[PDB]
Amino acid sequence: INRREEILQALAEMLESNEGASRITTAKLAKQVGVSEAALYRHFPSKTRMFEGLIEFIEESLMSRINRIFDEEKDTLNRIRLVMQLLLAFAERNPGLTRILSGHALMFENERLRDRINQLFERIETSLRQILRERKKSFPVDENILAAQLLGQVEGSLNRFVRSDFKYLPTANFDEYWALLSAQIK
């Protein structure tokens, strides 16, 4: 709530800087927070649980808004555009957390955390499929195939954002991408 949040904010700050390209050790994290390593463990059982805190924010932030789009916006193409733009803009507004989404920051941590990220992408892909299936006019392509292509474009954009040290902005080319695609998926 307070000290617990301070620690998570410190972790996200490091993920966002150059330090995010390397292991965030308890020693470096404690120094960023301005406390001893031991103090960290009064608020979290383990570093894995600190990352889980960030992952829970990503999950809830994204899925609550995707469900809202699904429930509140009526049109198929409109729904897809909003879900895509939400993902790209969320990443752009949260560079450090994108290093978690892309899996790079998690390489240093227990693999079950990458499993959790895989589960989130499957949830997003499921939403995409459901949105597409509700159009049934038919698509020039399988709904499962299109959903996978759409999320693939997002994943590649996130990867480019991270590997470029946040130079290649994920939203930059989305309008052109969507103009091209939407003219064909009718």
């Binding site: 904010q9 996200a12 700050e13 966002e16 960030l54 924010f57 932030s61 808004r65 789009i69 909003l82 733009q85 939400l86 803009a89 969320f90 507004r93 949260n94 450090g96 957390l97």
Partner: peptide, 10 residues
């Protein structure tokens, strides 16, 4: 666009 984009860092 989706206006309500959460930002984790203050």
């Amino acid at each position: 666009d989706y206006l309500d984009i959460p930002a984790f860092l203050r």
